[PDB]
Structure formats: structure tokens, C-alpha cells
Motif scaffolding. Sequence first.
Motif, PDB file in Angstrom:
ATOM      1  N   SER A  35      -0.732   4.278   0.621  1.00 16.53           N
ATOM      2  CA  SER A  35      -1.892   5.283   1.345  1.00 16.53           C
ATOM      3  C   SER A  35      -1.449   5.604   2.761  1.00 16.53           C
ATOM      4  CB  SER A  35      -3.066   4.297   1.583  1.00 16.53           C
ATOM      5  OG  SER A  35      -3.668   3.840   0.485  1.00 16.53           O
ATOM      6  N   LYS A  36      -1.787   6.708   3.417  1.00 14.18           N
ATOM      7  CA  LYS A  36      -1.421   7.318   4.759  1.00 14.18           C
ATOM      8  C   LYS A  36      -1.638   6.223   5.838  1.00 14.18           C
ATOM      9  CE  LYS A  36      -0.028  10.240   7.800  1.00 14.18           C
ATOM     10  NZ  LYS A  36       1.423  10.785   7.573  1.00 14.18           N
ATOM     11  N   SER A  40       1.081  -1.394  -0.090  1.00 13.39           N
ATOM     12  CA  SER A  40       0.080   0.066  -0.167  1.00 13.39           C
ATOM     13  C   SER A  40       1.129   1.364   0.061  1.00 13.39           C
ATOM     14  CB  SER A  40      -0.848  -0.115   1.246  1.00 13.39           C
ATOM     15  OG  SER A  40      -1.308   1.292   1.304  1.00 13.39           O
ATOM     16  N   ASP A  61      -6.412  -0.100   1.271  1.00 11.49           N
ATOM     17  CA  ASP A  61      -6.215  -0.284  -0.234  1.00 11.49           C
ATOM     18  C   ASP A  61      -4.727  -0.983  -0.751  1.00 11.49           C
ATOM     19  OD1 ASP A  61      -8.483   1.170  -0.953  1.00 11.49           O
ATOM     20  OD2 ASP A  61      -7.263   3.011  -0.122  1.00 11.49           O
TER      21      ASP A  61
END
Length: 136
Positions: A76-77, A74, A81
Motif C-alpha cells: 500500500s501507499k 504491505s 494492510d
Amino acid sequence: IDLCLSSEGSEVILATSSDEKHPPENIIDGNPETFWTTTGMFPQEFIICFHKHVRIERLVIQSYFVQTLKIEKSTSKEPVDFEQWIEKDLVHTEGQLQNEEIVAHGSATYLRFIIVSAFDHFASVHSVSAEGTVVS
Ligand SMILES: [Ca+2]
Ligand SMILES: [Sm+3]
């Protein structure tokens, strides 16, 4: 080791097993003899949080009894996802730990390691290393 080391700021989170004798932190302490082990059924997993953005060029995994290992990533922060990246079938060698090198590139903020199956009732992860660079 390398990017994955806790000494580098990384952390293991969301592990599906939490045996006091074999904590998740054992996966990234740079010590080949300490390990995290599974205690229940499968799939089992854990996530490595880099607490930064990195670009990976190589992965090294030291384990025991892991039959099928799936690695997702991932960018993402938060640990969300994830996308499938690698799905490897490891071999079992009597009296020996498993040492697998995987040469693949990818950017990530987190890596999700899934022990899909094991050669026994349990599996263990001694170390997970990632070679690469930190991106600002
Ligand atoms: Ca270790
Ligand atoms: Sm397969």
C-alpha cells in the motif's frame, strides 16, 4: 543492506523503542556493529519503508537475543494492510550474533518486523537486508 539501505532511500519508521544510543536508523546503515535495541515489553516492532515498490527475493537479518521474529509486508501507499509473510524462531548462540538468511519472494512498499519474544529482557537488531529489484 541492498534494498533496505538508507543510502538507497529506505527509512525505518514507527519503531516501538527509541533509545538515543541505539536509534532505528541503525538497522539500515550497512554497519554490523551499530544496532537498534528494545527498551520495553513485547511485542516490539519497526517498519522499513522503501519509498518505492520493490520485489524481494532474499532477506538477511543480523540480530541478538531475538527469539521469535514475525515479518509482514504491505504493498500500500501507506503503512497499512500488512499481511503475515514469515514467522521464524531464531536460535541463541553464546558469544555470537544471529545471522539468518530467508529465501522468499514478495512485492512490497513496506516491511513490518515484529520481535514477538526475546531470549532475554531485550533484543537487538543490527541489520536487515533485502535482495531484489525496484519496480516502477
Ligand atoms: Ca547497523
Ligand atoms: Sm514458532
